[PDB]
Design a protein around this ligand. Structure first.
Ligand SMILES: Cn1ccc(-c2ccc3scc(-c4ccncc4)c3n2)n1
Length: 328
């Protein structure tokens, strides 16, 4: 059964913890094990207390996120349908105890530097259960990189990586992310010039432009094996479908329109919608350190604009990857 925090986070690992994200779900810390950054996602479960204004998940209610995390991580090791484009999962632990004071330290630093929407997680008792997910460190989200990318060539690499990753997960797992807003796309330096994927036994490469993309956050995600479907049933959620101020909140409505409010079904067109929303962010809200000044550059720009105009007439990330001119 469950282990103390110290089994996941021995002192040295606790001491190098630094907070890098948060949600209603809980907290994400970066730390170092064997000279290697990792991301620790910590989720309180099974307790009656509100956390960040919401009821804690049960073990059952958190299983889907663990299952989907695992399935997508394992694609990096598969043969017919292989991608590294989802965040690697290193380990999952069920932990019991009060929140480590050293994590409160890191939580405070973050709250005074960047400010938190969360409760200070200091009210947990020594019986409190958490799930600790240890992920590879995927880098920084596209939203925080709004002003940080080199050029629209980078934008194309990112759309290519995302399209291939989703297409491999479509082919393998009948996967839909269902929440791939620009907070859920992480970017990391790679020295690899070419990134590799395999779709239904056919291997290809994507120019990195120095970035490795990692997809994160499976809150809303859906996939299946041998006809067992893991999905988040939002048929009755009301809030999710009433946002505005961003194309993001249209996608929730366009998904529900596409799937007739049946979230158990496979509608890979949801992945096309999210890729459309991301293409839209690339063209409208990203600002690049270099514009498209030279001929070849304006070419790429027109191709991404042509992608923006055309991609919604494709049925899946698989259909885009295989049939869209952007990728040829
Ligand atoms: C199921 N799942 C897989 C990753 C995630 C997630 C959620 C929120 C946040 S906020 C920051 C990260 C993160 C950053 C860097 N490297 C990995 C994860 C993050 N990761 N959830």
């Amino acid at each position: 059964g469950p282990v103390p925090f110290s089994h996941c986070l021995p002192t040295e690992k606790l001491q190098r913890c630094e907070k890098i994200g948060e949600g209603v779900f809980g907290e994400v810390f970066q730390t170092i094990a064997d000279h290697t950054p990792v991301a620790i996602k910590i989720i309180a479960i099974e307790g009656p207390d509100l956390v960040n204004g919401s009821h804690q998940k049960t073990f059952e209610e958190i299983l889907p996120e663990i299952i989907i995390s695992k399935e997508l991580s394992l694609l990096s090791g598969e043969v017919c349908n292989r991608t590294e484009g989802f965040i690697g999962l290193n380990s999952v632990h069920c932990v019991q105890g009060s929140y480590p004071p050293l994590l409160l330290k890191a939580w405070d630093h973050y709250n005074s530097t960047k400010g938190s929407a969360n409760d200070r997680p200091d009210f947990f008792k020594d019986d409190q259960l958490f799930i600790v997910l240890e992920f590879e460190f995927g880098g920084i989200d596209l939203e925080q990189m709004r002003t940080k990318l080199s050029s629209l060539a980078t934008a194309k690499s990112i759309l290519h990586q995302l399209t291939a990753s989703l297409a491999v997960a479509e082919a393998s797992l009948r996967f839909e992310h269902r929440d791939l807003h620009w907070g859920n796309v992480l970017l990391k330096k790679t020295s690899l010039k070419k990134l590799h994927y395999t779709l239904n036994g056919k291997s290809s490469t994507i120019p990195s432009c120095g970035l490795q993309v990692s997809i994160i956050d499976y809150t809303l995600s859906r996939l299946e094996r041998d006809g067992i479907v893991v999905f988040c049933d939002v048929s009755m959620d009301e809030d999710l479908f009433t946002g505005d101020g961003d194309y993001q909140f249209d996608i929730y409505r366009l998904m529900k329109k596409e799937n007739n409010n049946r979230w158990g079904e496979y509608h890979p067109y949801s992945n096309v919608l999210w890729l459309h929303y991301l293409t839209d962010k690339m063209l409208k809200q990203m600002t690049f350190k270099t514009k498209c000044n030279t001929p070849a550059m304006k070419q790429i720009k027109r191709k991404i604009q042509e992608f923006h105009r055309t991609m919604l007439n494709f049925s899946s990330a698989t259909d885009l990857l295989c049939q869209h001119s952007l990728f040829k």
